[PDB]
């Protein structure tokens, strides 16, 4: 497929949709190139803003990786909205900073904490100011939702701008997962850095020794089994248009830091939902003004939220989701797709019938 | 409770709702008494029409059998609609025909084929003409949905009148069911008639010999275990208001024919979705002008449809529903309630929060 070697822009214009790139600069210096799809490729050729956040080890191209009839972003554009695809520090086209290079350790010294605290506010302020729209619709997947949880429950002025928070495969805690991500709990920082170093996160061979990895190798392409996106989010591609795997592989992950994965293993080990542990009381103070990483109050997140979770989701496992839902003040909708796993929400051929359609509707009764 | 001995009308007026009875006469001579609830009991005391079809071995009273706050028909009336409860040939108050008696064999020589071809068109024509409304909203449960599938995919003029088809526990095929209805596959016509005869269908003892029946007897009332509705659709009454069981038992089944059950066992045996096999090429010609029962093209059913299916539904099993959904051109919504079985859709205490409320909303955005 021709899109295997196309960047986000080319992939979008390839299907005849409009594309715009903007540069957002975070408070702490990161420069993020965000893409915008201002209107449909004819369908609905001022308009309400809808922001899409990809998840863990993913890419902003997730929302654009298939046919225009089954990719959230394209269908949302044809439905009459102004689609903005969020880009996080570290991933492709977001690897620059005013004060340090991508080749430095300092550049990658971040986790989702920073994404919520800096990347989101900056990107949205930009979008509001550029569009003049006072509010927008937020759609997050996987880690994208957890960014929202943190942001929206600690940034009132930001939260006020979101009229509805659509969460696909939510993740606040990760204490009951069936994901290979658990194997990392067996690893201390000392070892973590010796295995993966600082900077960009690559699986290396850490996972070959695991059963699930031998089973994968047996069934699907080696290419798939040695890709961190799948290793941590599931190898199952039953509901995928297997003709486009090479496209997902060539675009994910877009750029994840070793620190971020370590923050998640910290969560796998504690089962809580809290900020990153910088290593010591002194270091945590220099970041949180406390000696202990603060916890994230999911019940202080009031934005009206709709949740869609999978029954076969190994990362955002039903059990964890189970503990989450009740804590959500103002949960306006919930649906559990039994045969759906973590990545089905983005790449499943029936994702429009199972999820997307519902969102389009739900949105066209608030802002539009 | 007092409703145990009340007819459909009395049950309705018992809660302070208006009631009207109308006589519909099918093309082939059957006389059906249909009930109408023209408005709420105070709530919304001209209005859009919503037709409700009960399912296999059920009763039109299903939509009225509980409290006014959890019975689809009542809530629909209070929501401002004109509710019509369909009655099928054979069941209570639909056991008369211009040319033969209920005591004859000919009277019961029917299956859902006839319900779709004759009962539905006639009842709806009448409703249209009476209310002046050119369109209506159709809500089917169990076999009620299958009637719709046939009707709406073969009767264009009829289909045009349905703006939205709400399907609860859909059933086009029945080849992967966990229902005792499978045991019938072990039976040939010769034996079927010797065991159940023609005319009305009674369980007789055919099912006592089965495990699920011993387990039921062990847990619930014998009354329940020897009632065809539950034997074929599930004995589980966890989500029910168990204080009203005696009401369900005294009203179901309203009247099912042995021929209808044989049509369903034919389906269990073939795994397909097709018309009734009258027994021989000659007999089939005299009914379909072919020698083989025609098949029902579910993909020819264009009415916008919304589907709600249960995770623990033994009859409308997830697997079968699984094969159906993809075939539906124009499926506008889908939700699978994991803990719901076949009859939960009508009698579950949280049916309003799980299904009804979304239907009311969904409707109040089309016609009303
Ligand atoms: C699954 O992926 C394939 C490959 O992208 C899709 O088929 C192609 O669709 C594009 C766009 O219409 C055409 O230009 C190509 O000619 C098609 N064939 C091939 C071999 O690429 C297919 O439509 C996708 N979806 C499904 C359900 O098959
Ligand atoms: C379950 O059914 C019982 C009986 O139908 C309900 O309780 C009755 O409710 C009606 C009206 O609400 C009263 O007139 C009766 O006095 C109540 N008790 C009895 C013994 O009849 C009960 O509310 C229903 N639902 C639930 C959840 O309890
Ligand atoms: C994609 O490639 C084109 C052509 O080489 C380039 O102009 C565009 O800027 C690229 N997209 C991004 C996000 O850099
Ligand atoms: C999108 O198009 C492909 C073929 O072009 C089709 O097979 C698929 O069902 C379509 N998906 C949707 C959601 O319409
Ligand atoms: C969390 O948020 C709720 C609601 O604002 C509040 O009652 C509670 O005290 C907060 N703090 C903690 C630690 O839970
Ligand atoms: C219910 O009973 C009443 C009084 O016995 C009767 O008038 C009414 O017609 C009955 N309802 C039906 C549907 O027959
Ligand atoms: C209906 O009313 C009864 C009390 O009569 C209550 O216990 C039940 O929970 C209510 N259900 C709904 C959906 O309102
Ligand atoms: C079934 O319906 C579809 C859509 O109307 C049609 O294309 C197909 O030829 C029909 N016939 C059969 C036998 O499937």
From Swiss-Prot, chains A, B:
Its main location: secreted. Pfam families: Abhydrolase_1 (PF00561). The keyword Translocase does not apply. Keywords: Disulfide bond, Glycoprotein, Hydrolase, Lipid degradation, Lipid metabolism, Secreted, Signal. It is found in: Secreted. Transmembrane segments: none annotated. One of its GO terms (biological process) is lipid catabolic process. Its EC number is 3.1.1.3. The keyword Cytoplasm does not apply. Residues 48-347 form the AB hydrolase-1 domain. Glycans are attached at residues 7, 69, 241, 297. It catalyses: a triacylglycerol + H2O = a diacylglycerol + a fatty acid + H(+); 1,2,3-tri-(9Z-octadecenoyl)-glycerol + H2O = 1,2-di-(9Z-octadecenoyl)-sn-glycerol + (9Z)-octadecenoate + H(+); 1,2,3-trioctanoylglycerol + H2O = 1,2-dioctanoyl-sn-glycerol + octanoate + H(+). The active site is at 142 (nucleophile), 313 (charge relay system), 342 (charge relay system). SUPFAM superfamilies: alpha/beta-Hydrolases (SSF53474). GO terms for molecular function: lipid binding; malate dehydrogenase activity; triacylglycerol lipase activity. InterPro entries: AB_hydrolase_1, AB_hydrolase_fold, Lipase_euk. GO terms for cellular component: extracellular region; intracellular membrane-bounded organelle; mitochondrion. It comes from the Eukaryota. Disulfide bonds join 216-225. PROSITE patterns: LIPASE_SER (PS00120). Catalyzes the hydrolysis of triacylglycerols to yield free fatty acids, diacylglycerol, monoacylglycerol, and glycerol. Shows a preferential hydrolysis at the sn-3 position of triacylglycerol. Belongs to the AB hydrolase superfamily. Lipase family. This is Gastric triacylglycerol lipase. It comes from Homo sapiens. The gene is LIPF.
């Amino acid at each position: 497929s021709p899109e295997v070697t196309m960047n986000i822009s080319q992939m979008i214009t390839y299907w005849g949709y409009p594309n715009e790139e903007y540069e957002v600069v975070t408070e702490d210096g990161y420069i993020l190139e965000v893409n915008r799809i201002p209107y449909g490729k004819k369908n609905s050729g001022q308009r309400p803003v809808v922001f899409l956040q990809h998840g863990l080890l993913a890419s902003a191209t997730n929302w654009i990786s298939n046919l225009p009839n089954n990719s959230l972003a394209f269908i949302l554009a044809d439905a009459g909205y102004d689609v903005w695809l969020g880009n996080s520090r570290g991933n492709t086209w977001a690897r620059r900073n005013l004060y340090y290079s991508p080749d430095s350790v300092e550049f990658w010294a971040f986790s989702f904490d920073e994404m919520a605290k800096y990347d989101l506010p900056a990107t949205i302020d930009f979008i509001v100011k550029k569009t003049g729209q006072k509010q927008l619709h937020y759609v997050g997947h996987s880690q994208g939702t957890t960014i929202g949880f943190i942001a929206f429950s600690t940034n009132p002025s930001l939260a006020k701008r979101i009229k509805t928070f659509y969460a696909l495969a939510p993740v606040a805690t990760v204490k009951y997962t069936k994901s290979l991500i658990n194997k990392l709990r067996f690893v201390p920082q000392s070892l973590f850095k010796f295995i993966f170093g600082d900077k960009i996160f690559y699986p290396h061979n850490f996972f070959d020794q695991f059963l699930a990895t031998e089973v994968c190798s047996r069934e699907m392409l080696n290419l798939l089994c040695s890709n961190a996106l799948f290793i941590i989010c599931g190898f199952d591609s039953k509901n995928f248009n297997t003709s486009r795997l090479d496209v997902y592989l060539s675009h994910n992950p877009a750029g994840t830091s070793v620190q971020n994965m370590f923050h998640w293993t910290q969560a796998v080990k504690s089962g809580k939902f809290q900020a990153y542990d910088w290593g010591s009381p002194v270091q945590n103070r220099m970041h949180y003004d406390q000696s202990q990483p603060p916890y994230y109050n999911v019940t202080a997140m009031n934005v009206p939220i709709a949740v869609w979770n999978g029954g076969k989701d190994l990362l955002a496992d039903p059990q964890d989701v189970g503990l989450l839902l009740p804590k959500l003040p103002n949960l306006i909708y919930h649906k559990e797709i039994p045969f759906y796993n973590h990545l089905d929400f983005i790449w499943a051929m029936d994702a429009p019938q199972e999820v997307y359609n519902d969102i389009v509707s739900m949105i066209s009764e608030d802002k539009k």
